[PDB]
Amino acid sequence: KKIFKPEELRQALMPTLEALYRQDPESLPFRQPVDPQLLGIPDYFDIVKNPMDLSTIKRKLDTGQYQEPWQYVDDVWLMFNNAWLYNRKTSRVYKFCSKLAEVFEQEIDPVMQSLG
Ligand SMILES: CO[C@H]1CC[C@@H](n2c([C@@H]3CCCC(=O)N3c3ccccc3)nc3cc(-c4c(C)noc4C)ccc32)CC1
C-alpha cells in the first residue's frame, strides 16, 4: 500500500494536533500525562492500561514514530477513550474530552481524505 514518510505525516497531521492544543481550557487535562499520584487517584493505572496524552502524541509526530496516518488517529482516539472510561459522564474532564473529539473529527476528516 501507499508508503508515507515522517515529514509528510508531520506536516499533514500536526495542524490537527495544534487545533486540539488551541482549545482552552478544554485541552488542559490532556497536555501532559495523567499523574495518578499527584491527583490522588491511585486506581488510575488499574483501569487505564495504555495511557496517552497530547504531549506524547506530539513527541511521536515530531520524532517520526508514525509510519501511517491511522496510527496517529489511533493514539488520539485512545487518549479520548481513556478519559471517557475513567471519568463520570457528568464530569468536567469527560465533557472537555468530548469537546476535543468534536474538534478532532472536524479537523482530521479533510486531512485523511487528502492523504488517501
Ligand atoms: C495543567 O495541569 C493541570 C493539572 C491536572 C488538572 N486536572 C484536573 C483539575 C482538578 C481540579 C478540578 C479541575 O477543574 N481540574 C481541571 C479540569 C479541566 C481543565 C483544567 C483544570 N482534573 C483532571 C483529570 C484528568 C484525567 C484525565 C484527562 N483522564 O482521567 C483523569 C482523572 C487529568 C488532569 C486533571 C488539569 C491540568
Residue numbers in the entry: 1082 to 1197
How did the manuscript describe this experimental structure?
Many proteins, including the EP300/CBP histone acetyltransferases (HATs), contain several targetable domains. EP300 and CBP broadly regulate the activity of other proteins through their protein acetyltransferase catalytic activity. These proteins contain several highly homologous domains, including KIX, bromodomains (BRDs) and HAT domains, through which they interact with, dock to, and acetylate target proteins, respectively. EP300/CBP are critical gene-regulatory targets in cancer, with existing high potency inhibitors of either the catalytic HAT domain or protein-binding bromodomain (BRD). Using crystallography, we identify the binding mechanism of the EP300/CBP-specific BRD inhibitor CCS1477 in complex with the EP300, CBP and BRD4 BRDs, and define components of the CCS1477 catalytic binding core that are required for compound activity.
Since recombinant CBP BRD was more robust in biochemical assays and crystallization studies, Kd values were determined for all compound-CBP interactions by MST, and co-crystal structures of the CBP BRD with five of the seven analogues were determined. Substitution of difluorophenyl with a less bulky phenyl (compound 5) resulted in a ~10-fold loss of binding activity, and the cocrystal revealed that R1173 is now hydrogen-bonded to the piperidinone oxygen but not quite close enough to the phenyl ring to establish a Pi-cation interaction. In contrast, milder changes to compound structure that retain the ability of compound to form Pi-cation as well as hydrogen-bonding interactions with the bromodomain result in only minor changes in IC50.
